[PDB]
Amino acid sequence: SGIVQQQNNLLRAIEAQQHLLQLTVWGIKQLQARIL
Amino acid sequence: SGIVQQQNNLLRAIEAQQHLLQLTVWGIKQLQARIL
Amino acid sequence: SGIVQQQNNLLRAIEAQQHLLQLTVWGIKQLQARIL
Amino acid sequence: WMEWDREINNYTSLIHSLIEEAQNQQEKNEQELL
Amino acid sequence: WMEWDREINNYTSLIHSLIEEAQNQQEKNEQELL
Amino acid sequence: WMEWDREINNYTSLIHSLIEEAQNQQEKNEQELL
């Protein structure tokens, strides 16, 4: 049970880090366009 | 079996997020150099 | 045992990727301020 | 930057693929504990 | 950029939350192997 | 930016270390199911 539960916790952390990665990718393209 | 399989899936997601992180690090140094 | 051990390894990778994400977020705000 | 864009998109799809698959597996694993 | 900042902070707290919880679970799971 | 570079490199090596180790463990765990 504690293992299936840990995997939930890691899956959730991975998903939330994916959101953060799409936010930094966004931020970079905006700076890129402004720089152009 | 489903647990070893989930760990595969998370390891793979972590690896693919690592690629994305090296891509945003790259993008940032390029903007940094252009800004300099 | 090898499973609890893998989960350690992934948790640790997630934590270290979180550090990297806070570093790219930082880098982006610095470029943003310089751009402003 | 055009190659950058492309490798972003490729890895973003891989990732999305992998997360859906892990959500499905996560559900099965929770069921099969019972 | 103001919305960007805000979604960063929201996801950063979620993440931090999730990592603490996984450190606690990691400890329990290591104990319970014994 | 010079400190930024350095903390990037330190965490990037840690991560790479951790992923290799998890690929090895992943292999063992797949074997030992049998």
Side-chain angles (χ1 to χ4, degrees):
Chain A
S1 159
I3 296 188
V4 176
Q5 185 64 29
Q6 188 63 325
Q7 286 193 328
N8 207 227
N9 293 331
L10 306 168
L11 175 43
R12 272 138 90 228
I14 293 170
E15 284 158 1
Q17 281 184 325
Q18 191 57 200
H19 290 301
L20 273 201
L21 278 162
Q22 313 158 347
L23 293 173
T24 65
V25 164
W26 187 91
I28 290 173
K29 281 136 100 127
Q30 290 302 283
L31 292 169
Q32 184 219 309
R34 279 225 36 200
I35 267 69
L36 218 206
Chain B
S1 159
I3 296 188
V4 176
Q5 185 64 29
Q6 188 63 325
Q7 286 193 328
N8 207 227
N9 293 331
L10 306 168
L11 175 43
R12 272 138 90 228
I14 293 170
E15 284 158 1
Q17 281 184 325
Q18 191 57 200
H19 290 301
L20 273 201
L21 278 162
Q22 313 158 347
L23 293 173
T24 65
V25 164
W26 187 91
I28 290 173
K29 281 136 100 127
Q30 290 302 283
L31 292 169
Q32 184 219 309
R34 279 225 36 200
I35 267 69
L36 218 206
Chain C
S1 159
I3 296 188
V4 176
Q5 185 64 29
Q6 188 63 325
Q7 286 193 328
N8 207 227
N9 293 331
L10 306 168
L11 175 43
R12 272 138 90 228
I14 293 170
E15 284 158 1
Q17 281 184 325
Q18 191 57 200
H19 290 301
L20 273 201
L21 278 162
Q22 313 158 347
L23 293 173
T24 65
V25 164
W26 187 91
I28 290 173
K29 281 136 100 127
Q30 290 302 283
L31 292 169
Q32 184 219 309
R34 279 225 36 200
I35 267 69
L36 218 206
Chain D
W1 285 106
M2 302 163 211
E3 302 290 20
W4 187 80
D5 284 330
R6 278 170 189 247
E7 302 194 25
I8 291 299
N9 286 344
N10 294 328
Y11 289 108
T12 304
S13 305
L14 185 49
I15 268 142
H16 197 246
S17 172
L18 284 165
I19 284 171
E20 309 153 4
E21 189 169 355
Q23 304 186 294
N24 295 339
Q25 193 64 50
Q26 182 61 32
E27 175 58 19
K28 302 189 203 99
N29 287 345
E30 265 151 33
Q31 299 190 332
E32 102 71 62
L33 245 45
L34 307 153
Chain E
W1 285 106
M2 302 163 211
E3 302 290 20
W4 187 80
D5 284 330
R6 278 170 189 247
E7 302 194 25
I8 291 299
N9 286 344
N10 294 328
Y11 289 108
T12 304
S13 305
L14 185 49
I15 268 142
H16 197 246
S17 172
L18 284 165
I19 284 171
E20 309 153 4
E21 189 169 355
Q23 304 186 294
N24 295 339
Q25 193 64 50
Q26 182 61 32
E27 175 58 19
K28 302 189 203 99
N29 287 345
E30 265 151 33
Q31 299 190 332
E32 102 71 62
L33 245 45
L34 307 153
Chain F
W1 285 106
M2 302 163 211
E3 302 290 20
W4 187 80
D5 284 330
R6 278 170 189 247
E7 302 194 25
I8 291 299
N9 286 344
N10 294 328
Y11 289 108
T12 304
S13 305
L14 185 49
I15 268 142
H16 197 246
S17 172
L18 284 165
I19 284 171
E20 309 153 4
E21 189 169 355
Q23 304 186 294
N24 295 339
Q25 193 64 50
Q26 182 61 32
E27 175 58 19
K28 302 189 203 99
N29 287 345
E30 265 151 33
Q31 299 190 332
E32 102 71 62
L33 245 45
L34 307 153

